[model samples]
Target: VSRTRSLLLDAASGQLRLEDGFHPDAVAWANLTNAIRETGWAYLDLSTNGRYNDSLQAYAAGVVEASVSEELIYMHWMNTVVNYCGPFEYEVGYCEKLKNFLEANLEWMQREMELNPDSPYWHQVRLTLLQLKGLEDSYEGRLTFPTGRFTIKPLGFLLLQISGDLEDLEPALNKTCSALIKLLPGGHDLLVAHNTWNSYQNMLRIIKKYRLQFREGPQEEYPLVAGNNLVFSSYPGTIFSGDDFYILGSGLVTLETTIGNKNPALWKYVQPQGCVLEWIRNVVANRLALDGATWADVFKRFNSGTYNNQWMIVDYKAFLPNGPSPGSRVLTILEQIPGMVVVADKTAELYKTTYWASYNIPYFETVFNASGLQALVAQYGDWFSYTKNPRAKIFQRDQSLVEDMDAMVRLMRYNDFLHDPLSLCEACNPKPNAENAISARSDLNPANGSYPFQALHQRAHGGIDVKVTSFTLAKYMSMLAASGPTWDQCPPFQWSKSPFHSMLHMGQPDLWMFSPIRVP
Candidate 1:
């Protein structure tokens, strides 16, 4: 079912096309010209036909991307694999061990597909696995799909597989990301913003638009096949948004912030079988789920406890300008950890409060205790509390000032650590913690600053980018995205002057300054 698909760049549209050899015209489209140095993010657009087998389409999509992004793929691999596991160590032997674990995982998925070909869930998993297969094959200039041994290189594991499985075998503090869904006053519009907090090394961003035309089978169809085209902020070699933001053409916008599990006991529930990781489940839910409740229902199916997060699902179709908004299940919230999921319709809460902010803490009391975040709060103070955290208070006070999208973006990128009272860290030497802001810049902390934890130290971690979107923008599937760390009011992240200069950052710009682009 897999073959070497022909690739061409159409001069008129400036999109790389991958053909399945069934016809002359292109079947898959990707934009390969925009390097991260020039443009804020590279772009990929996968558009396929439903007449052909979905498996073949999946493989060709991967091949087109792998052909263009080899350099980026390697750059991303080197910067991220720095001490990923518990005790802050990941090894070649560990890679081999992880490969074996994934091999068995793949075998189990294949067996499930064989047993349940008609099931929509397994069908998507099969297609995802095949896409990864095609990506691996083309990366090495070898066509090793279907007939040859399937191999996932180290890059493959870290990029996609490592996302939902990061806290599985070992426990590590995964505190990152800041998010908000603000219902604008008078119900005229709604705005959602997400700030991705992570290492500066992974700033090679991409605003991917997946126009995949997937189907169930030749004579069958998926539940909601059409209107599945989606755009998201992602890193290189990542199919799903590791930043966890998406604007779907299906009248929905979804994003997440990490709510990491702090308890070691929960790691035991992360078995390889009877579950799908967060990435694959994200795909299936985005492709099929039509509303907030349905998205939660779909995402909660496989309880893989890896990469725990609090997801905010916003349904723009449920809102009107001012009046007559009856069926108001416009917002639904879902938080997940190992073996536990909490989903609820929070449209009433949103209407009452006008905003919802998610830092790296669980909102539900049940989840807070079970995920061990409450215990973390006891040790680390209100920094781990949902309402008492600095970002929580910052958002609560600043969200009311957001009357429009521009104001919302300004608030998301707002980080005046020296001035903001809510950003105060009493334990630190300087008495201000940059990590407390909506868009953090821990790199700005003094080198000798002391704190209770590693996240507060001057390190290579913080919010690298910001994304904001509104109801009017979602209709056209677009969002205003700014790359490189936030430098609006604080010091810009420069590679040469920073301690992280030794880190791998190929194709990275020296100065992280750029205005938000209304992405096309």
Candidate 2:
């Protein structure tokens, strides 16, 4: 008889949460009051007790925020703007094949989670699936009678990871993001930054703070459950940060830049049984890892060979100001490509170079060869090489200027392509391409200009946001986040003026001029 319907996100929430099949003691709520209009992201905090099942709390988390989740689903995937590749001959059966593949894979993983109750990784994975269940349960009705009460689809969480995985299916002209680990003045502090590049239509974002109380047993915490509380940047429906950014409560900041697979032959290694998706394994590593070394160890298990990326884990707990060279395990970098994972402590590298930049290019030679990107470097130009990419040269040139947070932010969001000699392309019509800047504004490229490659063409893509955190700020879960595209040294991205204005962007603001704001 509990047919109550109230997923309303209100400031003055006079008890506005769905209460149909959720446990009576469970409490969950979401406030999207000024998420898009003011802050450009909403805050979701979910917690639960031991009375009802653990799945109930997660389910409640999704039910209360189902409205925003639907908007994200439509704006990101269901929108036609994602059709980046040309129609192919095998495109027909590919969808059906992928569907059955995912179903069997998820069923097997779900069985593994059910069998292994004591494993904390399985526990986290189950809760993610249950939460996604509740999100879909919000709209599960055949003819509006609401009788079955079934979880409509089981792939909601899995669907979110495919955005990061799509480049592997068909190579994209542009990779998705960029990241930097910078050494502050005198090596006294450390700064971690990430810039997410994507189409403007995919800009509806969220900042999630999950305060999960999951335990190993009745009164004892799990041995590997150090990161029970997580502060991460994400989309509406995703449990993990697709930007792959997280400030863990366990005194580590982890992020990644995608190094997508170029060799279609590597697809044979991506099987369903031995591995989980890249997204779940990432959450498991973040939850269990005590430091950068352990994070690399935990993350290298059973690579899915999908959504491959170069992962960087910064152990803020081990960083001491003005320490000796080659200090603690402060930073560890892992680069993954099908059937292989390469990891190393980059603290010495950071000491020597003063910074480490990842721009969707593999740093390790084996990974670069296995990913088949060396061929691109040979055929195209030095742009595909790890050491000579535009971002690499720009970082080398401008990173010395970063003595403080402001300078670091300026460099991360730097896109003065018309003036910077480092962003030049001799093969380009204009000679200086906007796509070569630190924060690429590909939309600013000339539509009629002849370019050597398609990635330099005018498009609906650019650096959509910047997130920065330092050693001191990360302990408090604080971050300086600029929600919209780079506009300080360039023109603001106005969706109404762009060719992609008619794309399906449900709640996006017309003018992306929001300044960076720090969240404490």
Candidate 3:
């Protein structure tokens, strides 16, 4: 007859009350207060090793606080919170708290699962740790969920990796990744969320050195893209096609940069996070799966606004010695913590299937475009407009707000400079049947305007890189000054264009030339 309810996040209390057949929605705050009174005394008693003495008294008293009554929620959140302390604190002992909490709670959770194996809480916690904690599940086949809980881990890993604790991070990191691969094969999309693609490639390097296997393989060795939908081709390099994965990360760079910048902190880190990366990995992976298809053949399902060709641009950040390629190891650690939360949240929530979530073919067609600027830059050095990219300034934190955007605009205008081949030698001799054909339109047809449509003639015509890009810029100005540039004429929409009129205008040109923006 213990039909009590409380609007609290305390998992244990909620479970205990729920076990008693309580109407959770009908519970009042007073009931929670009563339960706290009872449980607080019990927890306090246990804190002192069950002894009633001065030593125990001081220890018990020390643990008390103004919010002592809310210990349930504290403990519940604490079980997961410590997993994501920043690397500075993570190197110390801060992360251990979360580990111990998870382990301790696992015992109780296991018992609860034994009683009701079908419960979402049970599957969620079990699946989460199995993937994140790297535990071998007792029932290790294809992961099954009674609800949508299985879809939540990638985002949780994102938050955790961002705020990862350095100390004892390896065990959790390695095991979690291992379990994550097992439980969620397609969750790699989360890596792209925080603009962690560069870091993810670096982690692949680390994994390569360690020879630690994953559900996938080394991404750096086999980077691939088709239009906006990149098929995060895995380590040994294979395409994933099944229900085990989901895609949520297409157009993440623009998505992350364009969202409300209520907190200036995000400006410093202009990458996607949480659920964003998960989606990205899947989209990229899918694109890679398509292999070398023509522009028309590949873009059947592309969405112009959602999926853009910028994703197909090969990432050259990896070649730079001090590039943001590896980024911060702390970012890697943060990657793990948020993944858990994602899986947890997904477990608790339900999703309505949509075309983007179902099959990204139509979505791919809409976003498709001709040029593969990054791929060209990676292939031919001289063909690119500038050895360093201009638009990269949009990501820099050095300038004041006023000049920062002006610099970014200049950078976008110069974006047309990236090349697939080094010189006119190649552009003039446009490959007849090569898979990476007609690298760019920079030289012969500067008609596309400034948005990375052509190759840079670096060695023989470094001036052409400037000239072609400038011409394209002038073309953009003419269109914008005339017909008023629509979304089609403009560069891909970045997430940070709230206060600005255009992506090029978001950051000024002066700041775009020689800054950290080029490589990161």
Candidate 4:
């Protein structure tokens, strides 16, 4: 029984002493330890994969150490020690060894921070430590009991939860709701946004699962407010609600606003199908079901934020591109990689749900249509002539699958910009709508020069053309849209406010300028 208790207590130890009717708590802890060991070993494997740098090795080592330990009561102490030195080399109680390791490498972190001031590496480490400290303080001064034993009080269950003793596992997420608020000061960088969102969401999961007493200000605020502030200062083309960085933040805001509203009947009355309402009904509702929390309860917690203010709508009009017309389109070649088919389909579904099917937005004009896909292959067939394998019948398929639709869009953008430069005369005229404008285009010729697309294609797919089948393309486009400021930098076409007027001409060449497109 002593050996069984000892084995069950240490999460890293796989030894489990079993009996027909052993204490259920001990059995539960053994199971919990196994779970911890599984994930920790996964992290350990990644760190030792031979591809990581010293800095990354240090970070991942800390992650592996944090994951395997069952030091819930001394989590703050463990967190502090790990914050400085990385993870403990052994299990619990190796304080001096941890401290010495961290002290030796402290200068490395500071030097890296100075060398890469813009990078989020150190900020992420600091923020992670702060969160651990916050969680520690939130549960400070709580009473303790003997290890792997039952308690008498109803609140004793909470203590078991605090000590990482109960069935409630996942020590990596032993933080409180208040810990999320502490992360607010980190501000918005790509890494900061990713980490902060994860922390808050995990806290939400625990609150719903344990029915713990969580005191959050308004759901409309804290995480959402923190979310908005992060994106408010981002680059122009990828503002919130439009690009990948802003998408998750936008989802957070939309959920809080719609669900946290005064009336449930008014929910659908003022919501977009693929935007706010779809996220709550589809993602949030389904998630809450697993934790047995009613959708109403989720909203109740959201609406109870500390601050009482109307939702802040960020004005990004000043930073948007100038013109109702599609500004500059770039094609991104794709190659098949692991899990790309599934990801591409998911990306297409989100785009179709959010923008393509609803509004005739100019941004998606060339990429969203099946005809557009055929036109590109036809126009660029000469350049694509370099491919050893050319099948004329390949473009003659329906763009029904979500992956195909997304792939078509990406490929179209790559070709649109890579081709001959279009003048204002060619790009300006409004021929009814997005679909028609794309069809009415007369100059569908590929340029006879080595543009950057050649190099990009080579790098992405080893210069070999990916085979496009009936429902899938050769490669998958990542979550970040393949078209970015990099392609837009040395663009073939340029935006002009005025058509170049010749002094010899009697009148300015039908001068017409378009206004900015409105955001939906």
Candidate 5:
């Protein structure tokens, strides 16, 4: 007769039980595998009903010995253990046990990686171990590894930079930075540039303490390209997106100002983009005010209205899945500023066609507010028909909006402070001596051989650029054709849950909604 195991669940604690297994280890592993898979409200219900001290330790111990038949199962096991132990200190032994468990599996992983060198899961595992080792050793200084030509992935090397190892870290960073320069605009190689970006930031964290050298040779060049994209801007900065009128109305401006005041180093990098973002916010705010509705009421009052489609850089027909209502259309524009907005077909199309499309919510839909959208149409609707010629005044009555918008772009272009990529003088020269500060500001004579704006200005235009045009009826027809099949796309009108639901909910004021019982 073959030995069999009976798996059971505790109704009170939602913890699993195993009986009559072939071995004690087998039973323990079985309970752990079952426990990790349990989710939803029922699992919480068990916790509320009173799970006790021994039960918790038993579960944790079982999980540490959980067996996995596949790499994905191991990934799940790793994630579950991390989530479980995140609140506790490493001295509790869960961290050590987890590390040992993973180390025990390293032999199997090496064989797996040997067959599939490109597997990101295995690469991530290697990175995770380095992190654990750092925590175990309290990041003393320098890390020791198995002797051999073991595969060191970019992200793995990036993780090594923070493991508190200066002696080896400096040369490792030098090599990694060089490889990243060659991989800029990784195109189809997303991991390549993504790791480089992260690795570069890691270098920044330690640059002050180590005074590390990035370039290997005097003639070596360090290009500031990320992933598979080239750009004129120093970096993309943070692209804060929201679907609520309030975010553009006030949130972005406040956030920018707050960050600027609190963190000069951070603000210096994002200020140029922040200026444009604020301008866009003002435009949306003005429109919302003109509509005579708060963000709370806009969604309840949204109505379709016709407009000339010529001014749209992003087509309404291309933006909507079921297409716009009888008269008005989906506003495809990404950012609205005085007189005109920046539109891009790629922005919406990417959401509809890329990996995010699996979520079934368009990226634009996540960021744009449902009700505040009407205000956008009401104010800029005139642009759809007003100026027939590109050179004509955008708003005959208030032409200064156009002038101010142009000036903002020009300001970003002229401000070299925003353009400089690497600032060793700013990094190395901590004190603000008059002479040091002056030389820090100049690329001509950087304080410590630091090159600023190394390869900037090589690109003709930044990715944020939008084509300026007058509103025209023909523009709408061309936009529809240009957008292609996005017209046939259809997404469910109501979504109870989505990746962006929390962000969307928080976009509105919190106090106004729920009843004020203030239950004591």
Candidate 6:
């Protein structure tokens, strides 16, 4: 019997440490010393001196000494022995320094865990360190590892953190699936058993028993490539006759599909290449034919417009046979269209919310609103199309909208004060030095490092002019393509075109419909 465990959440709060309190006091003393050295006058007016006065001197000296200690600690933390910084923190000698801080954290963690056996946060922190240790060992570049899996390396820990300990996936899956069965009764196992594993196991069985052709990689780009030849190596009784064939990506797809099917908790993920409902109507109906009882035979007549039982079996059941690949014509046509849309309303809502909130910024709103990027779905929607069945309704923005945003973006120079934080001088305000009365117009300077002034350009009279240049569409497209995935190849750019159309129906499905209201 398996015991259920509650979900865990990790977070904690604590006060600042002792060193943090003393930093301000040291900076005050340093400023006092600097004033006496730099000028004979121990105390001078900060205004008109063009130099550091006594109070200013005191403030500066205090700041310098305090910062020195802080910097030393920061540097020590950055370079002691073990690396704590990631990505940007990578540098020679960084590892040794980070080790010191990490060890301290580790010591604290052990104490907390010992004191509070029931604390979830402490356990999470301990596990996190172990995970980090694993990651460091697994991907050490050239570092020595006594035992590959046992080593506390960064990549190994990262893998464990992401996929959980690799050695235990099966039992984990079994426990997860078995529990779901009780909650869903018969339907749960149907979802689990059909997940790609059954097909994989069945296929491997045939390959071992009989001669099977192997392809280095997938020959075509198609969605559901794994499902195309699922029955081949698994069931010897079936023969594949299709225009498209499974090449690469079958193994990965099978795993995902298997996990989705074998557990009711995962069934919500059974969205096919198209919309779940649409897939049930089309692909599932075709798959039902392999059982020697098409809808026409089972129901004794054709029900073209409705979702019949034949369609339901392929969408819902595991054992009812299907195909190697639908004919090339079917694959090509499907590839030409976008995949299904999941919770179309939610997608639209999220996109609209992001667009509006981001656009509302006074400086950015004009540029954003005018850009015609009202929502994400319409922004890069080509990948969502499916020729055989169009499932989503995209709401596109108008050209005028884009031009408006462009116009606003051009005016961002006026908001320069908002962008830059470090100023060279105080605001130029008028000050009656003798009377102690100050006027901003007489003295406020945008360049004042310690004072606040909002100006995009120079304050001096008759200064040189500067302006921003236009951002071209081609440049943005180049950057987007360079950064985004290779699979985001359609809709926003090239649409209804792919190479795998003739073979396997290889392509991406809209991960939307399969997303559970709340993932199990």
Q: For candidate 2, give the lDDT of residue 472.
A: 83
Candidate closest to the true structure, highest lDDT = 1
The worst-scoring run of ten residues by lDDT in candidate 4 lies at 176-185
Candidate 2 weakest ten by summed lDDT: 141-150
> Which candidate would rank higher by TM-score, 1 or 5?
1
Model 5 TM-score, all chains together: 0.17
Every model: Cα RMSD to truth: 4.9, 5.5, 24.8, 24.8, 26.3, 30.8
**Worst ten-residue run, lDDT, model 6?**
477-486
The digit string of per-residue lDDT tens for model 6 on 1-520 reads 1111111111242211112222322212211111111211111101011121222222232122222223222222222212323445544244333334234433544565567645433322332233233224222322121211122232222321222111122222232200000001221111111111110001101110111121112121212211222211111111110101111112210101100111223222222211222211232223223231232232222111111110111111222122222211110001001111111011122222211111111112222233222342243332212111011010122111223222222221111222222111222232111001000011112233332222212221110011111112111111000100011111111112322123221122211011001000
RMSD of 2: 5.5
Error of 5 at 282 (Å): 36
Using all chains and alpha carbons, the TM-scores for the candidates as numbered come to 0.90, 0.87, 0.20, 0.19, 0.17, 0.17
How do the residues 440-466 of candidate 1 rate in per-residue lDDT, one tens digit apiece? 998899888878898899988898888
**Candidate 3: stretches off by over 4 Å:** 1-92, 95-98, 105-116, 128-195, 198-201, 205-245, 248-520
Candidate 4 per-residue lDDT over residues 321-402, each given as its tens digit? 2222111111111111111100011122222221111111111222222113234335443222211111111111212222
Question: Would you give me the overall lDDT of model 3?
Answer: 0.21
TM-score of 2: 0.87
How does candidate 4 score on lDDT?
A: 0.19
Write candidate 5's Cα lDDT for 247-293 as tens digits.
11111100000000111122122211112123222222222221212
Q: Which stretches of candidate 6 lie over 4 Å from their true place?
A: 1-91, 127-484, 487-520
**Each model's lDDT:** 0.75, 0.73, 0.21, 0.19, 0.20, 0.19
Number of the top candidate by TM-score? 1
Error of 3 at 439 (Å): 20
